[PDB]
Ligand binder design. Structure first.
Ligand SMILES: [Cl-]
Ligand SMILES: [Cl-]
Ligand SMILES: [Cl-]
Ligand SMILES: [Cl-]
Ligand SMILES: [Cl-]
Lengths: 266, 264, 267, 268, 241, 265
């Protein structure tokens, strides 16, 4: 029901100690990480990355948080790229990837360079009608050949991925939507309103199912590292079953686990 | 020529012994498996899956059948999912079937029913078709082909949206994201599906099975290699060099491969 | 588990009714044994043999009292010498062994050759008698198995040995097979079933759910999305056995919207 | 966007000497153009054509003045209509050569790109299509198939549903259909085909050639398993040689001493 | 190089401040050693132990004086006998650490403790080392790197045997199946381990990280590509272009 | 395969014309031998050497009388000690996609780039004096391509990391025990045994061998492997009736008619 989904959002500030970002949590379980350097179009420097890593780790471990929003301060930029070590954004990438909660990129204005890869790493992207996308690597002597390349191809296909990287053009919201680069385009004024609705729709669903599916979708891409995530959830599920608990109920008691009492399914 | 492609279809019933499905065969080589529980929007129960497996196995082994259509009875549902895990076997069976399998979708293709249409090689959708998953809404998920293979169809952003929110999508939305192959008016659903089937029936069945195996091989690792190499082995038996081994068994001697060219 | 239990006698009960080419037996303690029974032709399989093995394996899969399957050949001279020299449904049998959620053990005496060699490789484990002989013959007789027979063989013995085995088609004795990691152990011929049964019993003492998940996980390193289907399929099954997994179905029995808000959102 | 420079006239120099089936030209600003020149048979390739295209592509690859390659067909009616029916599977070698070419390869498509000719445009990094371009496979209609990059890689472009449709039915698709499914990068009026193609080439020419080759290798690496890793790691090895730490090994030869890596930072 | 250098005494400096479950030490010549220090429970890890190992490993990663990490257990009887699920984080961290990590194994490496040694790039085993999984025996499993990556070490037949039966394997059995890199007498365990570390320390650290990433890339799909391309990007920055 | 045939003398014919760095020879019974001929520098390759090996291998590939290729070094002391102190990557691809078995015949040193070359060969026959290992990290270099990943598919991940990270040397027995080479023979019998192995493969179906080589590469090479494997499937298809119906329908004017062919399960 739209009334619930479009209800006002009550944000509580958790930004204490952060210089480059704001970090907020809603009552209903949304964490928002906001890059707060609009003076440089929300470009990240190594400190920014360190803070985002801290905030994301906090959101991950907070049982009241079910969904994370990543965004930039103001209306003009999500993140315009690189401005605690030089390439620690790779760590942040892996952390978004393996976060068992959906991460949503909320994009107004520029999502460019390293900043473009960040939105792609997020599970979903909600774009304002003023959003601008693209890579800049080859123009400025750099490249992201990791998830920035391969994973981009799993989103827009190999022809578009080569075009995006090789020419380093800019793409508006409609172009991004048509190639499947973003999930939806909404008027700028409604950007948070629609993003929050999408978040709430996910919050109504099973968090265990979401994490299993996220791991399964990563598993199509990440080889054994994906298997680690998917199997890791299987192991966790197993512990919540009787057969899984029989080991712990037994083996502590130096006796012996007895699995004979369990069905051997087809 | 359209007159051939849009010619009437002569269906013969082969439904004997089936409770949940109809199974029919056309003269020109199309097998049609129809989920027949419209009273529950064509949801499958385990018996339904067992029968579909039987019908598909039959269609696979019938040398007169070149293409299979999977569909639901009536206009309101293709399949609305599991009834409120042998469907995994049915999935693998659709996957490794050496003949093209076409999902013919009217109304709802939802949940386990949505995965079934995705598993089919092609999907022909009526303008009233509705698509989506429900797993996370009802405490379940398909993290197998229902996730990874979905991503190979619509891309990772859309796949995550479809699974994480569990919304419904109409025919046009499905077409735009590449989830279905075409959208036709409901009244023409079988007419157009049959035309697509006939177009494939005019082509080389060996070529089709090799290509199907090759396309699965981009997804299914060694299991895909088993399919692809399996066809290679079959092709090899149909060649002179491949027959020299068997003929050497007959003539009570050693095979002699020296008489064969060693190509670049 | 104590040797007295592991080496206790075995009581096979016949379930071979209607089978021409195979014997099919089940033990009280949960072992199913499928025995190719054409020792006159060194246990070569013909299409009927494959059809019967498929039936027996499907039966063992669906029997909740069965935890482990043994695949073997009648007599001491051959496990299986390949396809009958006198269509390709053995590929179906391969996929069936692969996706069987219970451990399948190849018990090999004498020849495991050609299609018969691929069969033992497909099995999760191989217990070999000291008289066992292994190898491929494809290139010698105008054929090949480039599926699991090639790729999966490489995942067992490595790419150099896999190329040697296929390209030359030599034979390898039990010790050579053991040294290259092709079989799990070598035992005297007289103790073949005794030791095989012990290995089966050791697995039977363990969690069947853990075994199926691990089997699926190990296949997943090889079988791309087909492996993900197996692994995720177990995850789905596990999920149904949890409270959160049941809430969906209970919201149906009790006629209400599901409420997942009452569940923890773990890290 | 300096359209003045992106739409400046192109100065082509002929390098076709000794070629029977193709034209081969190079521009002053670094574009090589390989043109299949058999328009009487809709630019179908025979084995000689493939051999010549392989030679021309190898030349373009080794020419440091060349940054981008255009692959196209003579005239307006066909890019390439496939293998010559009236006649070597050496087109597979050409495929692998396009794939591993460390420079962007651009398919410039007018009229028919069909069969083997359709796979060729797909192998190219980008495809610029005229509004009259026609696409599709024919394998299953004429007892053949491309189950290699023609299948798997097609799927990485248009998705698995469309890939199966394209192969199983062997229909033809017009430029707009190709664009909508992501099969080509852009559709332009026929009269502007080379003008726009050259603009795209020049935009790439303005960028770092090392970055382009690394990215091309990285994108292939999502598809080509260890063969992809060979390309990607190969560029890493090349980059390493251009660094001080990479040169210390070679210099420890020149000054006759053991290499000393202790003087280098051990980064996180 | 020369054995006198490789077998020279090792000067350890303690960096264990604030740790309850582990010792953490650094040598002058660039080796960091993380020691699980719960020998009473055969060096089993609890969640705190994992948290501390994660901290120590992050520290070693960011210390430019450190070229190689040793992971080991206190005493002679156990490397680690096994076990919220934060050990998965530790696994990824060992995996993506751009410096070689060496498991130095005395006595038991079992269960989760067995997976940890496998995750390390190399394993130096004492003649008394014992290896194996226990998952299926105690209602658990590691179907991630504990399964697939194990297969990439010992082959699919042995990996299935190890997991399905959950037996124990002695040092010689582990060596024969390629599970460990070498077996040395217990009394020489650290001496030989330190030698292996010093041999790596003599080599190019950039080469080592690129190779480690390349070897992971054969296993880890796009995550492996991220590591490998990441190094390429880093190299690119060090060039004129 | 009776030993008298397998151990019969080998009649080599020289085809080295125009080569500076290599010898290239062919036997009557279908073996091509490429020999790196710079024993003064332990058979290290320089770019010219690679160019010549590429030419010789391309020739062997296109010679229908050749079924198997031996790659080796002149003398007894070295197979190849690596790059001379990047076209070798092309030579690697070329060994990889050569539809005929390539056998590394290794005496003495196979080191660095020279160690990767033996690994790329389908099989390796090693003399009891053979020495193996990488040197990259010692001399500021690395091979992170097939030199890494494919090495792991041979000896496993633990041994691969050891070989690369430490850059030690390994003798024949160590190489055999880790599965790095296929067999170790006395130095004096190196060619005798290598030729036997070649002859054993020469007795087998060359189509089967190329399909299997492609299938084994396919476990490693993603879509590039699929290209090889499907390429053979396409070739096989052309040799069948159903495959020829397309071509026969063009050269007879008509539409192809596939209805007359069975639709197998
Ligand atoms: Cl010609
Ligand atoms: Cl604690
Ligand atoms: Cl405490
Ligand atoms: Cl392996
Ligand atoms: Cl791979």
């Amino acid at each position: 029901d739209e009334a619930m989904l479009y209800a006002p959002v009550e944000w509580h500030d958790c930004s204490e100690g952060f210089e480059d970002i704001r970090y907020e949590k809603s009552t209903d379980g949304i964490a928002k990480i906001t890059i707060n350097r609009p003076q440089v179009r929300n470009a990240f420097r190594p400190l920014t990355v360190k803070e985002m890593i801290q905030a994301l780790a906090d959101a991950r471990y907070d049982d009241n948080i079910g969904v994370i929003i990543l965004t930039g301060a103001g209306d003009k930029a999500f993140c315009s790229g690189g401005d605690v070590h030089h390439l620690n954004v790779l760590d942040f990438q892996r952390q978004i990837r393996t976060c068992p909660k959906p991460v949503v990129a909320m994009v107004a204005g520029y999502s460019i360079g390293g900043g473009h890869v960040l939105h792609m790493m997020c599970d979903l992207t909600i774009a304002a009608d003023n959003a601008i996308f693209g890579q800049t690597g080859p123009k400025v002597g750099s490249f992201d050949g990791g998830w920035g390349a391969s994973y981009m191809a799993r989103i827009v296909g190999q022809k578009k991925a080569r075009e995006i990287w090789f020419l380093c053009r800019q793409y508006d919201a409609k172009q991004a939507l048509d190639m499947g680069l973003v999930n939806t385009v909404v008027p700028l004024a409604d950007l948070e309103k629609e993003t929050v609705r999408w978040c709430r729709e996910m919050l109504q669903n099973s968090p265990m199912a979401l994490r299993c599916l996220k791991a399964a979708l990563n598993a199509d891409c990440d080889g054994q590292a994906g298997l680690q995530e998917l199997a890791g959830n299987a192991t966790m599920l197993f512990y919540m079953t009787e057969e899984g608990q029989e080991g712990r109920n037994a083996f502590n008691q130096k006796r012996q686990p007895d699995f004979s009492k369990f069905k051997r399914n087809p």
